Amino acid sequence: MDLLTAKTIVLGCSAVGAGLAMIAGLGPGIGEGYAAGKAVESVARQPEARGSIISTMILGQAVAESTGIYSLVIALILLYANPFLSKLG
Amino acid sequence: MDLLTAKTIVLGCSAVGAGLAMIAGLGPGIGEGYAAGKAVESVARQPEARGSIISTMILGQAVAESTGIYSLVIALILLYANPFLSKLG
Amino acid sequence: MDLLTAKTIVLGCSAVGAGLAMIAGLGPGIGEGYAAGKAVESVARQPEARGSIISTMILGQAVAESTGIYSLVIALILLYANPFLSKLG
Amino acid sequence: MDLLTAKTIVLGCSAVGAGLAMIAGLGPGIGEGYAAGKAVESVARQPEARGSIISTMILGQAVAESTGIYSLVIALILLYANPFLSKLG
Amino acid sequence: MDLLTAKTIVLGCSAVGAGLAMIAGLGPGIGEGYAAGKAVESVARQPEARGSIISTMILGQAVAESTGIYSLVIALILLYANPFLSKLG
Amino acid sequence: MDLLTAKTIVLGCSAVGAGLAMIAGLGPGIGEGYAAGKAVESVARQPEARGSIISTMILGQAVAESTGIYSLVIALILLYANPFLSKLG
Amino acid sequence: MDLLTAKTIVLGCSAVGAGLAMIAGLGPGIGEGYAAGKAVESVARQPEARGSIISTMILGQAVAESTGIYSLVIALILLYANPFLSKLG
Amino acid sequence: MDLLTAKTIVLGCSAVGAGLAMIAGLGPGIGEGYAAGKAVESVARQPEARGSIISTMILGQAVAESTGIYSLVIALILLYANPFLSKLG
Amino acid sequence: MDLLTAKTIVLGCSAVGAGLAMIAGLGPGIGEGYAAGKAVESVARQPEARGSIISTMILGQAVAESTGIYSLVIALILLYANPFLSKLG
Amino acid sequence: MDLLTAKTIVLGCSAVGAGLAMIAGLGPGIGEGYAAGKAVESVARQPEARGSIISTMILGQAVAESTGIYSLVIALILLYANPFLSKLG
Amino acid sequence: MDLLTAKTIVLGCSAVGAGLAMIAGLGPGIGEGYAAGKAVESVARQPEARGSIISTMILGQAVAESTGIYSLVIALILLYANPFLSKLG
Ligand SMILES: CCCCCCCCCCCCO[C@@H]1O[C@H](CO)[C@@H](O[C@H]2O[C@H](CO)[C@@H](O)[C@H](O)[C@H]2O)[C@H](O)[C@H]1O
Ligand SMILES: CCCCCCCCCCCCO[C@@H]1O[C@H](CO)[C@@H](O[C@H]2O[C@H](CO)[C@@H](O)[C@H](O)[C@H]2O)[C@H](O)[C@H]1O
Ligand SMILES: CCCCCCCCCCCCO[C@@H]1O[C@H](CO)[C@@H](O[C@H]2O[C@H](CO)[C@@H](O)[C@H](O)[C@H]2O)[C@H](O)[C@H]1O
Ligand SMILES: CCCCCCCCCCO[C@@H]1O[C@H](CO)[C@@H](O[C@H]2O[C@H](CO)[C@@H](O)[C@H](O)[C@H]2O)[C@H](O)[C@H]1O
Ligand SMILES: CCCCCCCCCCO[C@@H]1O[C@H](CO)[C@@H](O[C@H]2O[C@H](CO)[C@@H](O)[C@H](O)[C@H]2O)[C@H](O)[C@H]1O
Ligand SMILES: CCCCCCCCCCO[C@@H]1O[C@H](CO)[C@@H](O[C@H]2O[C@H](CO)[C@@H](O)[C@H](O)[C@H]2O)[C@H](O)[C@H]1O
Ligand SMILES: CCCCCCCCCCO[C@@H]1O[C@H](CO)[C@@H](O[C@H]2O[C@H](CO)[C@@H](O)[C@H](O)[C@H]2O)[C@H](O)[C@H]1O
Ligand SMILES: CCCCCCCCCCO[C@@H]1O[C@H](CO)[C@@H](O[C@H]2O[C@H](CO)[C@@H](O)[C@H](O)[C@H]2O)[C@H](O)[C@H]1O
Ligand SMILES: CCCCCCCCCCO[C@@H]1O[C@H](CO)[C@@H](O[C@H]2O[C@H](CO)[C@@H](O)[C@H](O)[C@H]2O)[C@H](O)[C@H]1O
Ligand SMILES: CCCCCCCCCCO[C@@H]1O[C@H](CO)[C@@H](O[C@H]2O[C@H](CO)[C@@H](O)[C@H](O)[C@H]2O)[C@H](O)[C@H]1O
Ligand SMILES: CCCCCCCCCCO[C@@H]1O[C@H](CO)[C@@H](O[C@H]2O[C@H](CO)[C@@H](O)[C@H](O)[C@H]2O)[C@H](O)[C@H]1O
Ligand SMILES: CCCCCCCCCCO[C@@H]1O[C@H](CO)[C@@H](O[C@H]2O[C@H](CO)[C@@H](O)[C@H](O)[C@H]2O)[C@H](O)[C@H]1O
Ligand SMILES: CCCCCCCCCCO[C@@H]1O[C@H](CO)[C@@H](O[C@H]2O[C@H](CO)[C@@H](O)[C@H](O)[C@H]2O)[C@H](O)[C@H]1O
Ligand SMILES: CCCCCCCCCCO[C@@H]1O[C@H](CO)[C@@H](O[C@H]2O[C@H](CO)[C@@H](O)[C@H](O)[C@H]2O)[C@H](O)[C@H]1O
Ligand code: NA
Ligand code: NA
Ligand code: NA
Ligand code: NA
Ligand code: NA
Ligand code: NA
Ligand code: NA
Ligand code: NA
Ligand code: NA
Ligand code: NA
Ligand code: NA
């Protein structure tokens, strides 16, 4: 096998692998959506506690975001700093 | 392998990887939908807080939207600014 | 590889990528469906707030629709304005 | 590659892509089913108000239907108005 | 490529595409099931409203059924009225 | 291509398509299950409406069953009345 | 292609198809588990109706079981009474 | 092909098929967990009925378990009593 | 085909099949998580009955665990006691 | 087939199978999140039993974690203690 | 087979395996989102207990995060410390 063939296959698989990882993002979308809905509900109940309701929402949502970030990092690594290239040529 | 073959295979996988990434969009669709439903029953029960209800919904939905945007960005990168092309020829 | 083979593989992959992206549409379908049910519930209880309720339903649904649109756009690009074809030279 | 081979691969991929897109239809199925459920129990509680309940149900369901329609359109395009064929020759 | 090979691959991918589309059917199964559950709950609480409960159930379920029908039609087309066969030559 | 290869590939894909179609069955399983659960709590709470509850359950379940049947029909067609064979030789 | 090659491919695809069909079994698993949970809750609140509750649970579970059975039948057919073999010769 | 090749491909496909069938196990995992949850809540609130509650849970869980067993059987058949081998040699 | 090839393909497929089977473990993870939540809820309402509540939790979770175990066993069999090897050479 | 190839295919499949197994981890993520949520609202309503609530949360989460561990173990085996290499001669 | 071919195939599969593993991240996203939602509610209803509510949320979300971490570890291992390469040559 030549180098170009090697790079081609690995990068092609890397593109697919990056896309698969990004699927995980649906999770935070659902979870943070729930927290948003609970915040809306709580604000309706107590329009004056809105400031503390929103700060709590953001905090919990930020935590829920983390796995989405992990996937994005994996995808960006596969796209922009591919760790397989150095092992081929 | 010739350069055309390399571009072809890599871009083909990139198209598939792009599609896979976009699957994540279902999450925000569900999550923001829940927030939407919560807003609907809230403005019906607490009309005086309609302003704060809507603004909280939009903010909460925007956070939940983020992983959808991440995937879209990965997809647009794979289609329009493909990082693998420069690694071939 | 001739040009015909290159176009064939890229466009074939593009068709699959387009279909995969469109799967995301299930999300908004569920989320907006939830918002719809909450509107039905709310107008049954507060028929006087109907205008406010539907207005809020449509707004929240429109937001939840966005990732559905993103996928549609990615699909339409892959089908009608394929950005890979110009790099096959 | 000959032209018949080219078309065969592309149309074959297009049939798969069309099927993949149609998977999104499950979303509206779930979401609208939820709206139907809330309509049923609203009617049971306010039988006099069936007309208003139903019209709200229909409107909400119609919105939730859209991504199912997007996928159907994409599928019909790939089947009946395939945009890749003109690119092959 | 001869004609038989062309038809073989096209019809083969069509069978898979048909199967993939039919997966959407799970959605209406879940959604209409929910509507059925709410009707049961409703006839239990308001048995005198049994007539309007059922007619409401059927109507809402019929709407949620539509994407299941879309997939069925796409599958039937791929199986019995295949639109790719005339594009081969 | 000889007739045997043509049949082979088409039948093989058809077997895969049939299995894919059958995945939709999970939907009715979930949906009708929810209706059963609702019937259980209703029959306990309201023993007078027992016959109407079960009548409502069965009717709703039967409706929710349809997409399951659609898939079974597509599967049986692919297995026993394969429409692709008469297109070969 | 010789007959053994034909049988190998068709049966191999049949094995995969059978497994795919069996995935549907998760549906009844979820749905009947829900119906069981309601029976548990109902029995607790009114042991004075243990017989009626369980009888209704079984009936509703039996209905929800059906698509699971359809998949088993398809799998059993693909494994033990393969309808494709007689088509090959 | 030779016999060894025939057995190789079919048993290989059978291994994948077995794994796919086993995916259905998630269903009973979820459903029975729900029933387990309701039992915890029910036993706690109605200790005097712990016996009929637990037996109700077990019975309901056993029914929900069936599709998991169906998949296990199919998997064990593919692994230990493969019905395809006699068709190959 | 030599014996090494036969083993190679069969074991490779067995690896994929084993991974596929393990996917079902998400089910018990969800279901038992639910039972855990109901227990926490019940403990908070009746802390004196913690021992009894936990006892019920473990029982229900053990049952829900079963399909996860089935998948683990199938995977360990495919990895450590592969039943396909004796059919090759 | 040479030895290097045998190792290549088997280890390649093992990498894929390992990733597939890890998908199961989503289950414990959801279930333990639910347990976390019920605990959050429990310590709010019963700060007195805060100790018992946490200990119950952890214990329940630990049980629901098990299928996630099983998949990790299988993945680690496929990666670090691959049981197929010894069969390749 | 040469060593470059071997490394190419193994690393390509490893890229895909890594992406598949990262899909598990969706679980924590949903689960921690639920915990976040309950926290927003509880904080709004018991604003004096804000400290212990958030503390309970974080502890709960941390546990639910673990399987997400497991997948990230497997992926990072596959990308940066690939344990298959030392088996090839
Ligand atoms: C909770 C927060 C988690 C996110 C933070 C985690 C650490 C940071 C990860 C960022 C995601 C990866 O993003 C990617 O990183 C790699 C380095 O690894 C960079 O890659 C870099 O190294 C390559 C390889 O020599 C060079 O061509 C160049 O110097 C540069 O591109 C990419 O330019 C960047 O797009
Ligand atoms: C929409 C905003 C919210 C989502 C945020 C998404 C963040 C991810 C966006 C892209 C991150 C990576 O950003 C990417 O970094 C690499 C660095 O190697 C850049 O790459 C650039 O530098 C490298 C390194 O010398 C050069 O070899 C290359 O020719 C050049 O293009 C890309 O041009 C840039 O797009
Ligand atoms: C809320 C988030 C934002 C939502 C709204 C935006 C949704 C996303 C829409 C993106 C679709 C258009 O995306 C944009 O298309 C044009 C098409 O000429 C691309 O343009 C690219 O291709 C053309 C092809 O002729 C080249 O000449 C050009 O040099 C190149 O840059 C842009 O690089 C791309 O960014
Ligand atoms: C999910 C991931 C899937 C990854 C799939 C990767 C599939 C393709 C692997 C190709 O490896 C082949 O290896 C041969 C042995 O190294 C090469 O022989 C060479 O020597 C051969 C003849 O012995 C010659 O024809 C040439 O050098 C070339 O053809 C050939 O080029 C190379 O392509
Ligand atoms: C999920 C994502 C999966 C992505 C899978 C991508 C698979 C890509 C396979 C590419 O196949 C290679 O193409 C090379 C270039 O054509 C061939 O060169 C080799 O073979 C040619 C054809 O025999 C010879 O002409 C060359 O000299 C020789 O180096 C090589 O064999 C062949 O294997
Ligand atoms: C999820 C997305 C997956 C996308 C997968 C895309 C796979 C694309 C495979 C393309 O296959 C290559 O095409 C080249 C076209 O050139 C071939 O060159 C070969 O053509 C011949 C081999 O067929 C050589 O002998 C001749 O020299 C050469 O020109 C090469 O071998 C072949 O492998
Ligand atoms: C999800 C979908 C993912 C993508 C699926 C892609 C499937 C691609 C199949 C490609 O088949 C092509 O057939 C050509 C028939 O010509 C080959 O011609 C190549 O090899 C021939 C060898 O004889 C030469 O004659 C030709 O000139 C040369 O272009 C070409 O390599 C090969 O790739
Ligand atoms: C959803 C996934 C769908 C995947 C679909 C993949 C479809 C295409 C398979 C193509 O395989 C090639 O087809 C060529 C046409 O029948 C054959 O003729 C080729 O012979 C040469 C290649 O050897 C060509 O270059 C010459 O034009 C030709 O006559 C060639 O042997 C064969 O390998
Ligand atoms: C998901 C669906 C997947 C389907 C996958 C398999 C497709 C395989 C390729 C097509 O069948 C090939 O077809 C060629 C014909 O198209 C034949 O061509 C060969 O025989 C022909 C007879 O006309 C000659 O013309 C060709 O030149 C010669 O290459 C031969 O059977 C074989 O190479
Ligand atoms: C979802 C997947 C479903 C299952 C798909 C199974 C596909 C199996 C492979 C395709 O069948 C083709 O049959 C042709 C025969 O019909 C073979 O070539 C042969 O044709 C002749 C033999 O008949 C040779 O002598 C000539 O060179 C050649 O072109 C060709 O290689 C082979 O690939
Ligand atoms: C996708 C999920 C479902 C399962 C898919 C399983 C696909 C299994 C493909 C096995 O590949 C086939 O093996 C045959 C071994 O014989 C080859 O025979 C080739 O060689 C024989 C002997 O010369 C000829 O009779 C054949 O026509 C010729 O295709 C054939 O080409 C090749 O494709
Ligand atoms: C989820 C989908 C899982 C699919 C799993 C199975 C995948 C099998 C892929 C490989 O099939 C190949 O077909 C070749 C066709 O030639 C065989 O040729 C070998 O054995 C043949 C037996 O006829 C000989 O004719 C050939 O000359 C010799 O090279 C080869 O061994 C076999 O490996
Ligand atoms: C979950 C899915 C797993 C899919 C795994 C797919 C593995 C494909 C491996 C490569 O295909 C090769 O095809 C050759 C036929 O074309 C076979 O006969 C070959 O073995 C040698 C391969 O070169 C020949 O040279 C020797 O004569 C022969 O017996 C060989 O065994 C087989 O490996
Ligand atoms: C689901 C994921 C599946 C991932 C793995 C897919 C694995 C198989 C890729 C194709 O495999 C072939 O295996 C041959 C060994 O069987 C290699 O050498 C074979 O060919 C070489 C020459 O190219 C020499 O060893 C001799 O000619 C012949 O052994 C050949 O390069 C390689 O392409
Ligand atoms: Na997180
Ligand atoms: Na977000
Ligand atoms: Na949105
Ligand atoms: Na919509
Ligand atoms: Na509809
Ligand atoms: Na129906
Ligand atoms: Na049924
Ligand atoms: Na059952
Ligand atoms: Na069980
Ligand atoms: Na467990
Ligand atoms: Na965890």
Author numbering:
A (entry chain C), B (entry chain B), C (entry chain A), D (entry chain K), E (entry chain J), F (entry chain I), ...: 1 to 89
Which of the paper's sentences describe this entry?
In the Fo sector, eight to 15 copies of subunit c are assembled into a closed ring, which rotates around its axis as ions permeate across the enzyme. The c-ring harbors a series of identical ion-binding sites, typically one per c-subunit, which selectively recognize the coupling ion. The c-ring features two glutamate residues in each of its 11 ion-binding sites, instead of a single carboxylate side-chain as is typical.
Crystals of the c11 ring were first grown at pH 5.3 and one of the crystals yielded a complete 2.2 Å dataset. To confirm the location of the Na+-binding sites, we calculated an omit electron-density map. The most notable difference is the presence of a second glutamate side-chain, Glu32, in addition to the conserved Glu on the C-terminal helix (Glu65). Both side-chains contribute to Na+ coordination, via one oxygen atom of each carboxyl group. The other two oxygen atoms are at hydrogen-bonding distance of ∼2.7 Å from each other. In addition to Glu32 and Glu65, Ser66:Oγ and Val63:O from the adjacent c-subunit also contribute to Na+ coordination. Ser66:Oγ and Tyr70:OH also interact with Glu65, as hydrogen-bond donors, stabilizing the so-called ion-locked conformation of the site.
